[PDB]
Design a protein around this ligand. Structure first.
Ligand SMILES: CCCCCCCCCCCCCCCCCC(=O)OC[C@H](COP(=O)([O-])OCC[N+](C)(C)C)OC(=O)CCCCCCCCCCCCCCCCC
Ligand SMILES: CCCCCCCCCCCCCCCCCC(=O)OC[C@H](COP(=O)(O)OCCN)OC(=O)CCCCCCCCCCCCCCCCC
Lengths: 59, 80
């Protein structure tokens, strides 16, 4: 079959274009993820502490 | 023309924040009456040393003792 990606058009009305001018000029995006999705450090690290602990295998 | 002013704010909303502050700092100093207080305070700060003038006859005001009634009111600031 198909799909179409990156085919969209901006709405072009003054209820929208503030929402894209409250973004460029106030940085309301770009702090969304890497203000956050980075931290999100609070998860337990994953490390196999090597000289002692060791990892899985199979027969 | 307002469609223009909203169609540059969908593309470059950066310098627009500079113009928006470019004016609005030029305009206002001719408005708020708080100013011209600013010029009175700044004139009255005695950097130098006041030298007493010679009194023969007048002597409009300002007696020998300073705290006696002498001259203008600068204490509108102390209450301010
Ligand atoms: C001349 C009028 C000044 C007083 C206006 C009174 C303020 C009231 C609100 C004004 C609303 C906006 C008025 C017109 C805005 C201009 C729209 C436009 O397309 O011009 C930008 C035009 C469009 O240019 P462009 O089409 O090449 O797009 C490039 C724009 N940038 C830079 C974002 C990539 O660009 C310019 O020539 C501006 C360069 C001059 C930069 C001066 C910076 C300001 C310095 C302080 C003054
Ligand atoms: C009446 C009083 C006045 C009223 C004024 C109203 C508000 C006006 C004040 C707004 C001014 C805010 C700062 C100036 C605007 C931000 C700077 C800017 O304009 O970025 C524009 C930049 C250009 O990107 P673009 O035009 O889209 O082109 C690329 C297309 N692929 O587009 C961008 O997004 C660039 C983003 C920045 C680039 C570096 C980001 C790297 C990460 C650093 C972020 C950390 C900073 C956080 C602040 C920390 C503070 C402690």
């Amino acid at each position: 079959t198909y799909k179409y990606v990156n085919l969209r058009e901006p709405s072009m009305d003054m209820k929208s274009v503030t929402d894209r001018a409250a973004q460029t000029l106030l940085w309301t995006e770009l702090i969304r993820g890497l203000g956050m999705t980075l931290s999100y450090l609070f998860r337990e690290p994953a490390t196999i502490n090597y000289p002692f602990e060791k990892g899985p295998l199979s027969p | 023309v307002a469609a223009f002013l909203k169609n540059v704010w969908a593309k470059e909303p950066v310098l627009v924040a500079s113009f928006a502050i470019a004016g609005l700092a030029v305009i206002l100093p001719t408005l708020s009456p708080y100013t011209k207080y600013s010029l009175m305070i700044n004139r009255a700060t005695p950097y130098n040393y006041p030298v007493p003038l010679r009194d023969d006859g007048n002597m409009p005001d300002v007696p020998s003792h300073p705290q006696d009634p002498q001259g203008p009111s600068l204490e509108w600031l102390k209450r301010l």
